[PDB]
Amino acid sequence: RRWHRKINLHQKRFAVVSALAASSLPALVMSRGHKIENVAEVPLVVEDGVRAYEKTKEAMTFLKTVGAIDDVNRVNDSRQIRAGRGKMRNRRYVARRGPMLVMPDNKGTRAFRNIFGLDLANVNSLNLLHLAPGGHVGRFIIWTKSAFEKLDKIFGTFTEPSTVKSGFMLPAPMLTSTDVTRIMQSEEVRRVLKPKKLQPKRPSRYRQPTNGIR
Amino acid sequence: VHSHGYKCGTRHLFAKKFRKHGVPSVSTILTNFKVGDYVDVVADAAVRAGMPHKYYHGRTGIVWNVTPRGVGVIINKPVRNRTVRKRICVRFEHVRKSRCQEAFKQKLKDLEAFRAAKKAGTPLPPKKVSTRNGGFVCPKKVEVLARRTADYEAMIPY
Amino acid sequence: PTRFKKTRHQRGSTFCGYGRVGKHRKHPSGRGNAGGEHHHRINFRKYHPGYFGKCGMNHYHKKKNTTWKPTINLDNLTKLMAKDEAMKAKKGEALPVIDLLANGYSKLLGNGHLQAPCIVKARWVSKLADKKIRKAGGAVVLQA
Amino acid sequence: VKPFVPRNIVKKRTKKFTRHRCELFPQLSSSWRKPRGEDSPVRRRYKGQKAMPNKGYGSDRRTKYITPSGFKNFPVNNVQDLYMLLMQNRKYAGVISHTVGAKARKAIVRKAHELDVRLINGNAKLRR
Amino acid sequence: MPKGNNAIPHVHQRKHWNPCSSQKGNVKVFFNQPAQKQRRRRLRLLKAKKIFPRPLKALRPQVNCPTVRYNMKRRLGRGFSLEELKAAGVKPRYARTIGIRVDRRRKNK
Amino acid sequence: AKSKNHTNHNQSRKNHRNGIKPPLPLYMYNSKRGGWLPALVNTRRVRKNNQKAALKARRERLAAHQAAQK
Amino acid sequence: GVDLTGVQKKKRVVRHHTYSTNPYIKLLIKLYKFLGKRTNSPFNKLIHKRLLKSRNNRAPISLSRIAVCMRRRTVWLKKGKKSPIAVIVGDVLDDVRMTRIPALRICALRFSKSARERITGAGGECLTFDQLAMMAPTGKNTMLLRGRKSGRESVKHFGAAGVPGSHAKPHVSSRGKERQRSSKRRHAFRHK
RNA sequence: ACCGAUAGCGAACAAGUAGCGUGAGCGAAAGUUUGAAAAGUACUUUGGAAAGAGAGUGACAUAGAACCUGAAAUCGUGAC
RNA sequence: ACGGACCAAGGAGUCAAACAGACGCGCAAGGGAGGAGUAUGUAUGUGAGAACUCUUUUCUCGUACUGAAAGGGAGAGUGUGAUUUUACACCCGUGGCGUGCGCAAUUUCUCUUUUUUGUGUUUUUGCCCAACGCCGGCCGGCCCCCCGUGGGCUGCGCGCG
RNA sequence: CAUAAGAAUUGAGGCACCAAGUGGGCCUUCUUCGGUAAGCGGAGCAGGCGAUGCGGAAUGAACCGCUUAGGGAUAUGUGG
RNA sequence: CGUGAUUGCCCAUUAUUCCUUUGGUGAGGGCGGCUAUAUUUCUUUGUGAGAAAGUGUAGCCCUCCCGAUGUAGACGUGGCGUGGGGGUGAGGACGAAGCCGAUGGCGCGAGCCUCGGAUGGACCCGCCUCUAGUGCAGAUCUUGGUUGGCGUAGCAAAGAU
RNA sequence: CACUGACAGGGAACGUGAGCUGGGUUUAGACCGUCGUGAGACAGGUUGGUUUUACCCUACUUGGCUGGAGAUUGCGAGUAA
């Protein structure tokens, strides 16, 4: 069976690339089941100092305080035994997914174990599957500062190809401007607009082909 | 199903008919051409070359070519859902200029000539009448009809 | 993928849309290549003309590497060439240096009209370079 | 359109179209399918028949998937969800997915009747 | 059958030796490959560990190497060149002990 | 039971489905090919000519940009 | 009694609840659809429409073939209007032939990296159509580039009763000598 | 990202068994009491006997060992 | 004419190469790696066929074709001189069409807007047509033969990547 | 484009890509061949049927009328 | 006289007309940040009650139009079901699921929903994506099953209690 | 041939096999003559050569063997002189 594939390299990546932006296109992120009452900077960019935290509790707590409560609480707790047969092909339990910390690399203690889908990543990864639950993107990346910064070096820029992927980078927007719609409203455009209609309702003939008093 | 020569014959068509036998006239030869002429096709017999197959007498096409002895006529031949242009290699002897078109143009110019004259040349100059109409009538002797049998003994079959 | 397949759309339906006429069972009525000459002629002739027979001539044990490709034509090169160069050398007071090999090829056939004399350490050329390179004051160096 | 008022009936039938002879074979079931049926009078729209469903019959697009009490039933399992509905009076009545066990109905029901907005569960048969 | 105008008469798997309810047979999928990769890898690394004092790759020459298509190219080829090795000076046997390849069938053009 | 040959009926009906075509006949211009070679030789010499008309399609261009460029 | 339709319920042909997966377009069209009709502008409408098609149906265009267009300016006017607007609903690929050609303004879907740059770099301007339209409503000294179409290869593979009239290359298996091409390049076998 | 007891190996089962065929060989069928457990219905009493009716048990015996469910075809009944 | 006593559960258009179209989809004369291999922790593991890749070498197919060959081979740019071997110049081959762009008349509108009219004009990459021209090809023409001004038949070729 | 005298149309045209499904037909006005003939055979034209029903012909594949969204209201069709 | 009693009709899926439906290379429009547009309608010869009166109105909605049988065959689905994946609904023993239901209803339908247990009793389902050993009357289908057939045929040799 | 008033002709899936029968018919065996090179053949000859099922539906025969409609009332007046 063609249990297998190619993907084009530019494309696989490119895609992810759209995704990365959309990892911080917040509505999307919220929409993504991500919640944080906590919500503030999108992405909420965090000390890399965090990474060294070695007691689970310590770490988590701040993390909770700083965010992790709802989404996290969806996590662990939306855990269900997989109903249906996948269970009986060993998929016994299912659960959703909650917010992402990306590490430059991990060095806490615990470190942060006992919880996957509640991401942690050594940057040089970024796995779309983790990035896009159900291929339906939007996740909260919680930055280590060191990841955060490193990131850019990773994608280069549009007009500055070169990273560690060779030329592959931020590259062209199509239309340069969203809020097109806004744009579309204009004034120039709005001037050249063409004027309209009037005189409405109540019919002209109001049947009667036959003469009469009507 | 039937036998097929590319010159397969007929009863009474190709045969060179009613006192119409013999060579083409010198008038035929004195003719003169240009191309693009819409000329119609006929078959002498004379020489059995430059001679189309059956389709073609009674058809009008246009010449595209003049070769030594002959002329090229492209004709639209109707096949299936179309007419295809076929360019046929006749020696001159088997083709002639119509009037088909002649009139149209002839009139058109003549008329233009008049239309132009009428404005914008000097004169001015009646032609025709309308179509068809009514009328006063002062006739002066109507009849009727009484047919057959009276004085049938004078006439009819036996 | 399963769901797209016609089949899905085509059940309760016997023929599989094959036609109610034509209860064309699972056999060839044909089969692979052959029979091209009788019952498929018109097609065969038509759609793959020049087949069969064999004629012209042959080179047994041919070893195609040995021919492996060599050709480039002109403007082509400049593009490969650093734009700096290509927006500069023109005059003939700087002939930038092009080694064909990296470009691949080996042979130069005409075309192009360039936009700087340069050096192409080039391996073979059409007639035209004597009239092109040369005309240009561009250059060929044949390899040695 | 319905009520008040169009000038005639709201369907031409809706008694389900089935096969024919369903009635006959008991292992045969009563579901609507297109006759294939080569000589089929059923295909052939000969007179003797029963009906088929067709786009000419359709319910007025404006006036369709609308209840009797004028609402589309809207599926609900809970009070939060229900709390969203509030605006609506036009075209939905929430229907509680009865389909999920009860205790919560004790909660939903309490809130909903309390919240003064329809649910058929909460409005049908001998209890509210 | 459907009307679609697509790329004429094809598709291939419905041919020879694809073992059916028959049996056969000439089988050699690559699905092992992950595992294989690992097999190469895991081993390779693990090998290193063992060998360990040793510089791994064994010196060999450099060559320009074949063809036309390769006429212009160099690869570090097999072997060495005893002659060269000689020319640097070095007993081949000894060289082998050092872990620098040797050769013969390098005729040395 | 005598096993019938063939026929033509339905055909003008079939032929008229898809109609009866000619193609814009004289395309706007001919379909090419053939003629009398002494004439064909001569016509090329009056199409020599084309390089003359290409310098007439350039004559106008020059006039616009030499009259004034303002 | 109905009667002939010249073909009944008139076929997709040129299309409606429409095409590809790029989001932007979807806007564009909303934007533009007003504009051609309700900013009465054939050009706009055209634009609008022109936006709609599929990829083939948006086969590219490339630069030097625009050069010419900017020879057109040059035989246009002494020059009161002294400016000009290019459109291409595809990518602009670089060409080659010139490549010392001037700067100028091109309004495209996409300009290659190289091109984009180099164009712009040459004083050109790559404007996306957002970057056009908005600041360009209404034509006039607009230049529709309607792409190409023709020079695809596909049509090559249209034709094979190899009569003296049909000269066309089949989708066959010789990529070298014979392998289905043995005569024709000799008159003789299986004639012409 | 397999199947779900007619599936799935032949074979979930004392199965490559049983069985079958001279033999070569051929080679099946066949799943689950218990909110927890036999607590597996004492006892009464009729009943040759089975058994019954009681009783007795147990949430539940429309759970009494044919044990989860218990589909349909088919039939008695009730009821009409 | 056949098949069809009944009810459960079964019970039939699959995977899949090159390939043609269609369509989305990537990038674009390159593209596609591709085989592999390295590679460093998330930490089971790890220095992810499948994670992330990541890639120098490139490989491979693609970005001129033509000839059996031997073999050649495309702005025969354009233009130009041109007795155009050449030699010069260096921001559209020739014509037919062209959404377009221009102009004027044309309505109102202050002007704008500008309805409407009337035209102009523009590369055959906007499409196609129509004709050279061009590559390999073939006859080598013109002529008595052969060569040059120049031919003159032909082709999956080329004509503004 | 007037005549002074002689269309109508033109619910687009142009133009194309590519794949199906089909190759036993049968019925008819008309013409017509074979043969006594044949509800026979065998062609020509148009139309059907086929592959549609509705309405008519007590009965009818092809005769009459007429073709079909779903209805409603009205009037006709053939036919009474 | 001059017509006139006065009204010759009956009756198809055709026709008209009218509605609703549906499709359409279909027409309109409103498509605004309070002018307006749909919903509901008064006081009811010249009213949108912006202010009489409730309700809806972010590119769709709201009006308009032509057409609308079709086998084979084809195409379409902001069509329908299912098995399973990924995401997302953390849906429930206050009894899952299964199942029965002259139970109702929604949807042209395909389904889908609902309300019942004198049901059944624990795992199971929504929605968006993925993805399929994916939707049966017939195959002289198949396995199982289930009949009627019908207490009918029939139990009638080998001498007999 | 014989009788006889009389020895008409027909129809009924060429009426008429779950009627028989099997002499006719057409296999196989087997003889001959012919023909055939041949095997074989032969619409030549010859000869011997496996004729099932009803219990069912219906149909037919006998044998048993049971009512009435419905309307203002199937809501009641139980021919009509």
PDB file of C-alpha atoms (C1' of nucleotides) in Angstrom, chain L residues 36-77:
ATOM      1  C1'   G L  36     -14.883 -44.111 -48.063  1.00  0.00           C
ATOM      2  C1'   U L  37      -7.270 -44.499 -48.249  1.00  0.00           C
ATOM      3  C1'   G L  38      -8.298 -44.197 -43.662  1.00  0.00           C
ATOM      4  C1'   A L  39     -10.697 -43.748 -39.194  1.00  0.00           C
ATOM      5  C1'   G L  40     -15.013 -43.495 -40.605  1.00  0.00           C
ATOM      6  C1'   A L  41     -19.590 -43.116 -43.230  1.00  0.00           C
ATOM      7  C1'   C L  42     -24.345 -44.580 -45.222  1.00  0.00           C
ATOM      8  C1'   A L  43     -31.398 -39.741 -44.217  1.00  0.00           C
ATOM      9  C1'   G L  44     -28.803 -47.891 -47.059  1.00  0.00           C
ATOM     10  C1'   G L  45     -29.944 -52.472 -45.258  1.00  0.00           C
ATOM     11  C1'   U L  46     -30.158 -55.438 -40.942  1.00  0.00           C
ATOM     12  C1'   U L  47     -30.685 -56.840 -35.783  1.00  0.00           C
ATOM     13  C1'   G L  48     -31.189 -56.144 -29.898  1.00  0.00           C
ATOM     14  C1'   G L  49     -31.224 -52.919 -27.317  1.00  0.00           C
ATOM     15  C1'   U L  50     -32.984 -49.167 -18.964  1.00  0.00           C
ATOM     16  C1'   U L  51     -40.157 -45.086 -20.932  1.00  0.00           C
ATOM     17  C1'   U L  52     -39.847 -41.857 -13.476  1.00  0.00           C
ATOM     18  C1'   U L  53     -42.553 -39.083  -9.787  1.00  0.00           C
ATOM     19  C1'   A L  54     -49.217 -36.790  -7.618  1.00  0.00           C
ATOM     20  C1'   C L  55     -49.044 -36.511  -1.205  1.00  0.00           C
ATOM     21  C1'   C L  56     -50.028 -30.315  -3.934  1.00  0.00           C
ATOM     22  C1'   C L  57     -52.789 -26.049  -6.488  1.00  0.00           C
ATOM     23  C1'   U L  58     -56.200 -26.096  -9.889  1.00  0.00           C
ATOM     24  C1'   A L  59     -59.078 -28.652 -12.706  1.00  0.00           C
ATOM     25  C1'   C L  60     -63.148 -33.268 -12.587  1.00  0.00           C
ATOM     26  C1'   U L  61     -66.068 -36.936  -9.587  1.00  0.00           C
ATOM     27  C1'   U L  62     -68.770 -38.461  -6.034  1.00  0.00           C
ATOM     28  C1'   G L  63     -69.031 -37.914  -0.452  1.00  0.00           C
ATOM     29  C1'   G L  64     -69.538 -34.749   3.521  1.00  0.00           C
ATOM     30  C1'   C L  65     -70.175 -30.018   5.252  1.00  0.00           C
ATOM     31  C1'   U L  66     -71.739 -23.978   6.875  1.00  0.00           C
ATOM     32  C1'   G L  67     -76.046 -18.938   5.473  1.00  0.00           C
ATOM     33  C1'   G L  68     -78.479 -14.132   4.220  1.00  0.00           C
ATOM     34  C1'   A L  69     -76.389  -8.746   2.754  1.00  0.00           C
ATOM     35  C1'   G L  70     -77.218  -4.073   4.160  1.00  0.00           C
ATOM     36  C1'   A L  71     -79.897   0.863   4.965  1.00  0.00           C
ATOM     37  C1'   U L  72     -82.601   6.093   7.801  1.00  0.00           C
ATOM     38  C1'   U L  73     -80.859   1.195  12.924  1.00  0.00           C
ATOM     39  C1'   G L  74     -76.212  -3.898  10.520  1.00  0.00           C
ATOM     40  C1'   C L  75     -78.817   0.422  16.244  1.00  0.00           C
ATOM     41  C1'   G L  76     -85.074  -2.101  13.888  1.00  0.00           C
ATOM     42  C1'   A L  77     -90.649  -3.402  11.946  1.00  0.00           C
TER      43        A L  77
END
